[PDB]
Amino acid sequence: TYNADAIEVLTGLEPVRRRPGMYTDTTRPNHLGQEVIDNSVDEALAGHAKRVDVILHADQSLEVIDDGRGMPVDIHPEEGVPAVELILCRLHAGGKFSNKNYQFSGGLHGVGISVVNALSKRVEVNVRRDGQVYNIAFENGEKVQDLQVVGTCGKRNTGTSVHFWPDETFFDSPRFSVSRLTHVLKAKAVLCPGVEITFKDEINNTEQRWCYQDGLNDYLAEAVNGLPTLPEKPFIGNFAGDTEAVDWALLWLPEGGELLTESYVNLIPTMQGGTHVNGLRQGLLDAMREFCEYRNILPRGVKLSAEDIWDRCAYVLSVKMQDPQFAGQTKERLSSRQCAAFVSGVVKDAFILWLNQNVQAAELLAEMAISSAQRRMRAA
Ligand SMILES: Nc1ncnc2c1ncn2[C@@H]1O[C@H](COP(=O)(O)OP(=O)(O)NP(=O)(O)O)[C@@H](O)[C@H]1O
Ligand SMILES: [Mg+2]
Numbered sequence: 246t247y248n249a250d251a252i253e254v255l256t257g258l259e260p261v262r263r264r265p266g267m268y269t270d271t272t273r274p275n276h277l278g279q280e281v282i283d284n285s286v287d288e289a290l291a292g293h294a295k296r297v298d299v300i301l302h303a304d305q306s307l308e309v310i311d312d313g314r315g316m317p318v319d320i321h322p323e324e325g326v327p328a329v330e331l332i333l334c335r336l337h338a339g340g341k342f343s344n345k346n347y348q349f350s351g352g353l354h355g356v357g358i359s360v361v362n363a364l365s366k367r368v369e370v371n372v373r374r375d376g377q378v379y380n381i382a383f384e385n386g387e388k389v390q391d392l393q394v395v396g397t398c399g400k401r402n403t404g405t406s407v408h409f410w411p412d413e414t415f416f417d418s419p420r421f422s423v424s425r426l427t428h429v430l431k432a433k434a435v436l437c438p439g440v441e442i443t444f445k446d447e448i449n450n451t452e453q454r455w456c457y458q459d460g461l462n463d464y465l466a467e468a469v470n471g472l473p474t475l476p477e478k479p480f481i482g483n484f485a486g487d488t489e490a491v492d493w494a495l496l497w498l499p500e501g502g503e504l505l506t507e508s509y510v511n512l513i514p515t516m517q518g519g520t521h522v523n524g525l526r527q528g529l530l531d532a533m534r535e536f537c538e539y540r541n542i543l544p545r546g547v548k549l550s551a552e553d554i555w556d557r558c559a560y561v562l563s564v565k566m567q568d569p570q571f572a573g574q575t576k577e578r579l580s581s582r583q584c585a586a587f588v589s590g591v592v593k594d595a596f597i598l599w600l601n602q603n604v605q606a607a608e609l610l611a612e613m614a615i616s617s618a619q620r621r622m623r624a625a
Pocket of ligand 2: 331332333334335336337338339355356357358359
């Protein structure tokens with residue numbers, strides 16, 4: 246039979262435990278770690294947290310500590326439960342559905358930490374607020390320890406600590422990728438100037454710390470250091486408005502070499518790019534086309550295409566949006582339609598102006614793009 250009883254209604258964290266693939270990267274637990282790290286970074290971005298400490302424990306569990314405002318522990322006026330339980334056990338429950346708690350945040354779904362909870366054998370949360378320390382714990386997504394006061398601390402000492410033990414049953418490998426972890430963490434320090442980021446690995450017995458006042462430029466430069474580039478130092482630019490901002494560092498490696506191509510939205514690494522990256526690409530192409538067309542150095546029958554200025558472009562792109570739109574909980578791609586035009590406009594304007602005031606380096610770049618077009622033409 247196929248009647249009403251055939252329809253099942255999953256509630257709480259059950260959908261995450263039943264369909265893990267839709268909520269996280271099941272390759273390894275690193276992404277679970279990023280959900281937690283992102284939440285701490287959002288506090289730093291809002292200017293509340295000054296540091297985020299991450300610890301990979303010998304038992305392969307992960308602990309993330311921040312000195313932000315701390316997760317709210319008071320009773321929710323409508324749900325009648327401490328905000329903390331709500332945040333940990335309910336999907337689509339969070340403080341980033343508006344811009345009242347954070348102006349620019351990587352979080353927006355009200356799902357992250359609850360996914361960490363659903364896929365962990367155990368989760369311990371500690372909050373420091375009002376000169377008091379609170380504790381609450383879960384196992385397999387279910388609360389096993391009610392919110393309780395575990396002591397006193399300085400009134401000015403506030404923050405959140407999350408320690409979780411991933412359930413190996415949901416991942417290809419239960420081991421945390423160390424290189425991925427440090428790559429993600431260093432980037433946070435680069436993208437949020439002044440915030441101190443630390444990573445203590447107790448499996449391999451190491452400890453690192455990252456804190457950069459400048460950031461972008463050196464990050465790209467060092468990544469390509471020792472490789473011929475054009476121009477000699479990265480082309481950088483930025484624009485900041487109330488609801489949006491864009492920052493970048495880029496250059497080309499025409500003679501070959503490993504390219505660095507990273508894009509971010511509210512410090513969330515968008516590994517699959519998206520509309521913001523499309524904008525950067527289009528802007529660079531529009532400006533180069535203008536330079537070539539005006540200087541009349543474009544051979545008859547030769548038309549530049551995106552590939553001609555993108556193929557060997559190494560770049561780091563960091564965008565801020567009051568209300569981004571990602572294609573999935575993993576946030577690998579930004580699908581926010583208007584961000585393409587936004588980035589494109591800023592980049593084209595900055596690049597054409599830079600080109601016009603750096604004629605020598607510009608002509609070399611132009612030659613690089615044109616020869617690429619002819620190479621591509623002869624190929625077809
Ligand atoms: N370390 C923290 N400090 C202060 N508040 C926090 C912290 N972690 C979580 N919260 C809050 O709890 C809410 C729910 O977290 P979460 O379920 O991860 O949703 P999210 O922030 O929208 N992220 P995401 O689902 O990945 O887009 C957040 O929106 C914050 O209001
Ligand atoms: Mg939630």
